[PDB]
Structure 1
Amino acid sequence: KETAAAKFERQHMDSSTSAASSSNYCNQMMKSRNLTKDRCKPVNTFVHESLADVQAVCSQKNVACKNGQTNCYQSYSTMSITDCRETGSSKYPNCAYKTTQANKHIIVACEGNPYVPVHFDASV
């Protein structure tokens, strides 16, 4: 079965671009990463940083996750991210998203050995 670590890279890493240069980015990436296969995932964040820089966050600022868990980590630095939010015209299977390019700190949950990101918690 897909590992939690592999799922994180599939749902949230986009190292091949510096930013979302098109307002269509979310519509394309949500579909291409199979986040719209069974239903329209309502929100998703893509990180435009090297995998190594994102994995490194697991050894940065320990913080409580939104749900109270204590295996969350906040990036010391802001990162290039793209927020994807479902629009009012979204209708499975034609999922539609609003694309928002931003520069923010990311908060991820980490697990395992090697200790890596398995969940995207928030951007602050």
Structure 2
Amino acid sequence: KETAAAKFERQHMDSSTSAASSSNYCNQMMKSRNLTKDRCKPVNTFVHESLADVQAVCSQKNVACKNGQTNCYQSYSTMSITDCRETGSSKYPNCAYKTTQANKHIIVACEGNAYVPVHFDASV
């Protein structure tokens, strides 16, 4: 059992690097964050900002989530992020990922109190 807040940190936070390293960043990160354990997670985004900057997004712009809920927030500024998506030539347990580095606003759903990010909804 992992708290929803802890799961968000593990799947989406990468404060140790300013941006994706090389084309192998995703294969390495998806593996060490245990996102390739029983299955290959198809899509996952990593945010390269402090945990505190990502958490502050829960007090930023209140916007709707793609699912219609209203506890999503879009960051006022763009953040360094890296999208990891399985390549068509990927097959569990030999997971393969395309790394796409970019700067975009992130939108996250927040919940609990402490009111922290619990789901990565999208980047803009």
TM-score bracket, normalised by the shorter chain, equals over 0.9
User: CA–CA distance in 1 between the matches of 2:18 and 2:94?
Assistant: 26
For residue 89 of structure 1, report the CA deviation from its aligned partner.
1.1
Can you list the C-alpha shifts for 1:50-98, whole angstroms capped at 9, x where unaligned? 0000000000000000000100000000000000011011010011000
Looking at structure 1, the residues matched to 84 and 21 of structure 2 have their Cα atoms a distance apart, in angstroms, of 13
Secondary structure of 2:2 counterpart? coil
Normalized against structure 2, the TM-score is what?
Answer: 0.99
2:110 match:
110
Shift of 1:18: 0.3
Q: CA deviation at 1:38?
A: 1.3
Deviating above 3 A after TM superposition, structure 1's stretches of 4 or more consecutive aligned residues are none
Q: CA RMSD in A?
A: 0.5
Q: TM-score with structure 1 length normalisation? A: 0.99
Identity of counterpart residues, as a percentage? 99
How far, CA to CA, are the matches of 2:17 and 2:53 in structure 1? Answer: 15
1:62 aligns with 2:62: yes
Cα offset, 1:21, TM superposition: 1.6
Match of 1:97 in 2: 97
Distance 1:87 1:42 in 2: 9
